[PDB]
């Protein structure tokens, strides 16, 4: 059900994605994310075409973190911001973070060294139903994605799609 | 003249671009580059549509250099490698680096402090301004290497497509 990925550039870093459906407490999760009583980055899964898009965002996040050149104040926000087409942080977090009105949530987190996330506890904090990440394509909304990244109606493979999105995430 | 820029996340670093036309000793400047008796990345100017292209490649290289994560042996090679959309190192230096029978050369170098009027005296040719780059740049070559639509678009538009080609390379 979890998706786990060892960063090839930063081997000691592993990134985990967890997906939840039927979420009855998005309102509180958002507050916990905003007073930091919750691990990970809470990401609106409606606008994430493939976990691959999150892995690029996280890879860049870790990179600026290791350089000490994050554009945002923390690793968790930096992941979310990297998803955005543009330089507004306060708009980026609004659009790609969760809102109280989401019923589906994607959480993303990174571990290296001694710092290990209590996954079992994180899961228990979501009043929802954890689903496999293979479920993303039906929770995902292709019109929103295309709107947000200013993309062409002309349908394409997730691969072509991903390169267009990755490009809009690099140039902002 | 010369053009110079601050690096994105390291304002204490400068990229300098020097353009040269009517170069006689390209063959030797290439031998010396290797050897390391000349500073900088020696670059094919016929495939550069805008300095910005160089800036992206230099940023990207320095951000790996500062961690010792470069794909190539050295910073000068890394910059040239970053210009190519493909992974093969040796193929990227061949298209983007200089060859024995070139008569135009672009030198690119970073400081955090290289002189310069000796560097100029390395090149057995005339130093012209960078505004001069559009008139050497082989447009049908650019299209073949970056694989762009044939149908004629703006330098601005072509540049974006070029920035995307570089931006989708190795991402993970």
Swiss-Prot record, chain A:
What is the scientific name of the source organism?
A: Homo sapiens (Human)
In the UniProt entry, the disease listed is: Galloway-Mowat syndrome 5: A form of Galloway-Mowat syndrome, a severe renal-neurological disease characterized by early-onset nephrotic syndrome associated with microcephaly, central nervous system abnormalities, developmental delays, and a propensity for seizures. Brain anomalies include gyration defects ranging from lissencephaly to pachygyria and polymicrogyria, and cerebellar hypoplasia. Most patients show facial dysmorphism characterized by a small, narrow forehead, large/floppy ears, deep-set eyes, hypertelorism and micrognathia.
The record's listing under SUPFAM superfamilies reads: PF0523-like (SSF143870)
Q: Where in the cell is it found?
A: Cytoplasm, Cytosol; Nucleus
Keywords assigned: Cytoplasm, Disease variant, Epilepsy, Intellectual disability, Nucleus, tRNA processing
Quote the cellular component terms of the Gene Ontology held in the record. Answer: cytoplasm; cytosol; EKC/KEOPS complex; nucleus
Pfam families recorded for this chain?
Answer: CGI-121 (PF08617)
- Taxonomic lineage from the root: Eukaryota, Metazoa, Chordata, Craniata, Vertebrata
> Which protein family is it in?
Belongs to the CGI121/TPRKB family.
User: What is this protein's tissue specificity according to the annotation?
Assistant: Widely expressed.
Give the gene that encodes this protein: TPRKB
Q: What does this protein do?
A: Component of the EKC/KEOPS complex that is required for the formation of a threonylcarbamoyl group on adenosine at position 37 (t(6)A37) in tRNAs that read codons beginning with adenine. The complex is probably involved in the transfer of the threonylcarbamoyl moiety of threonylcarbamoyl-AMP (TC-AMP) to the N6 group of A37. TPRKB acts as an allosteric effector that regulates the t(6)A activity of the complex. TPRKB is not required for tRNA modification.
Binding partners and assembly: Component of the EKC/KEOPS complex composed of at least GON7, TP53RK, TPRKB, OSGEP and LAGE3; the whole complex dimerizes. Interacts with TP53RK/PRPK.
Identify the InterPro entries for this entry: CGI121/TPRKB, CGI121/TPRKB_sf
The cross-references to PANTHER family, in alphabetical order and at most eight, read:
CGI-121 FAMILY MEMBER, EKC_KEOPS COMPLEX SUBUNIT TPRKB
The organism's superkingdom is given as Eukaryota
Q: Which GO terms describe its biological process?
A: tRNA threonylcarbamoyladenosine modification
- Keyword Amino-acid biosynthesis tagged: no
Protein name, entry field: EKC/KEOPS complex subunit TPRKB
